[PDB]
Curated annotation (Swiss-Prot):
Subunit structure, as described in the record: The DNA polymerase III holoenzyme complex contains at least 10 different subunits organized into 3 functionally essential subassemblies: the Pol III core, the beta sliding clamp processivity factor and the clamp-loading complex. The Pol III core (subunits alpha, epsilon and theta) contains the polymerase and the 3'-5' exonuclease proofreading activities. The polymerase is tethered to the template via the dimeric beta sliding clamp processivity factor.
Any one of the GO BP annotations: leading strand elongation
Domain of life: Bacteria
Keywords, ordered alphabetically: Cytoplasm, DNA replication, DNA-binding, DNA-directed DNA polymerase, Nucleotidyltransferase, Transferase
Localization, UniProt: Cytoplasm
A single MF term (Gene Ontology): DNA-directed DNA polymerase activity
Principal subcellular localisation of the protein: cytoplasm
Entry similarity comment: Belongs to the DNA polymerase type-C family. DnaE subfamily.
Protein name: DNA polymerase III subunit alpha
Coiled coil: none
GO CC annotation terms, alphabetical: cytoplasm; cytosol; DNA polymerase III complex; DNA polymerase III, core complex; replisome
Free-text function comment from the UniProt entry: DNA polymerase III is a complex, multichain enzyme responsible for most of the replicative synthesis in bacteria. This DNA polymerase also exhibits 3' to 5' exonuclease activity. The alpha chain is the DNA polymerase catalytic subunit. It is tethered to replicating DNA by the beta sliding clamp (dnaN), which confers extremely high processivity to the catalytic subunit, copying a 5.4 kb genome in 11 seconds, a speed of at least 500 nucleotides/second at 30 degrees Celsius.
Length: 312
């Protein structure tokens, strides 16, 4: 019953061309690699691609260091990888070059906070991926528009409706429990889930995915069961992410410390926001496949979306 949105013939051709660019720029391509004493014949597809990954200083102050992210994907043998920093494209020129040097397909995106008239003034998460060079231009506009108009201590914010003019060549991951649909599912606001989802089915046909995430954070699994039930009733696709904030598990303690500094709280303040889990590291293809064994379609979509995202 769960929809896998397949890359079409045209998107497949653009993906094959995009991997040619990887190979012709950097001299290798992990997607087309044959292991020693394997054979071209028995080469295999990736099973999962990380489509939501932040560098260490994504939302806070400091440089966009994307090389350790490429280096880890390379340690892991992942053939493709997205960078989706918060409302910014800082690390992109370096990520693109390093992905190349590593034989990895670079996927371009960004994470936003979004406001929409249906949820009044509250802010929700959306991940935006660029599927083609028009989309990459539309991504840059959206980022610019979010800064152009001004921002408070809440930060740069996109209006949901800007997505109407700027929709072309964009693929959306819904924000999970933090998105407009997820918060309304968790609230049991069916009328509103219905409204939101009609927005994306109108303007983003096959380009909107309910994001599922298993990082042991509150309401994650209740949102997941509800999102799956919705997906099945509406024919909407689901996609697995790990919402990566740091490279290894052992990185959590310093990530917790940095965010605490930025927000202003000691680590022993029972009031300190605890929005992160040590499970938000760059999990292996195999760990992700195990963690979502019960929902193979959420994995398949990552791969299809990775083939559909071809920014040169």
């Amino acid at each position: 019953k769960l929809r896998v949105v397949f890359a079409t013939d045209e998107e497949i051709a653009a993906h094959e061309a995009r991997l040619d660019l990887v190979q012709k720029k950097g001299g290798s391509c992990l997607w087309r690699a044959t292991r020693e004493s394997g054979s071209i014949g028995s080469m295999s597809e990736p099973r999962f691609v990380h489509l939501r990954v932040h560098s260490d200083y994504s939302m806070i102050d400091g440089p966009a260091k994307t090389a350790p992210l490429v280096k880890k994907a390379a340690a892991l043998g992942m053939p493709a990888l997205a960078i989706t920093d918060f409302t910014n494209l800082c690390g992109l020129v370096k990520f693109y070059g390093a992905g190349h040097g590593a034989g990895i397909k670079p996927i371009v995106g960004a994470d936003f906070n979004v406001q929409c008239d249906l949820l009044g003034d509250e802010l929700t998460h959306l991940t935006v991926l660029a599927a083609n060079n028009t989309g990459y231009q539309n991504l840059t506009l959206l980022i610019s528009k979010a800064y152009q108009r001004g921002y408070g201590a809440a930060g740069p914010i996109i209006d949901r409706d800007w997505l109407i003019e700027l929709n072309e060549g964009l693929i959306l991951l819904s924000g999970g429990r933090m998105g407009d649909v997820g918060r309304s599912l968790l609230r049991g606001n069916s009328a509103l889930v219905d409204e939101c989802v009609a927005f994306y089915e109108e303007h983003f046909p096959d380009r909107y995915f309910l994001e599922l995430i298993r990082t042991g954070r509150p309401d994650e699994e209740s949102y997941l069961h509800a999102a799956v039930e919705l997906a099945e009733a509406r024919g909407l696709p689901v996609v697995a992410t790990n919402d990566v904030r740091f490279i290894d598990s052992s990185d959590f303690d310093a990530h917790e410390i940095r965010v605490a500094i930025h927000d202003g709280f000691t680590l022993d303040d029972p009031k300190r926001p605890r929005n992160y889990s040590p499970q938000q590291y760059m999990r292996s293809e195999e760990e992700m496949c195990e963690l979502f064994a019960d929902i193979p379609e959420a994995l398949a979509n990552t791969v299809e979306i990775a083939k559909r995202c071809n920014v040169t």
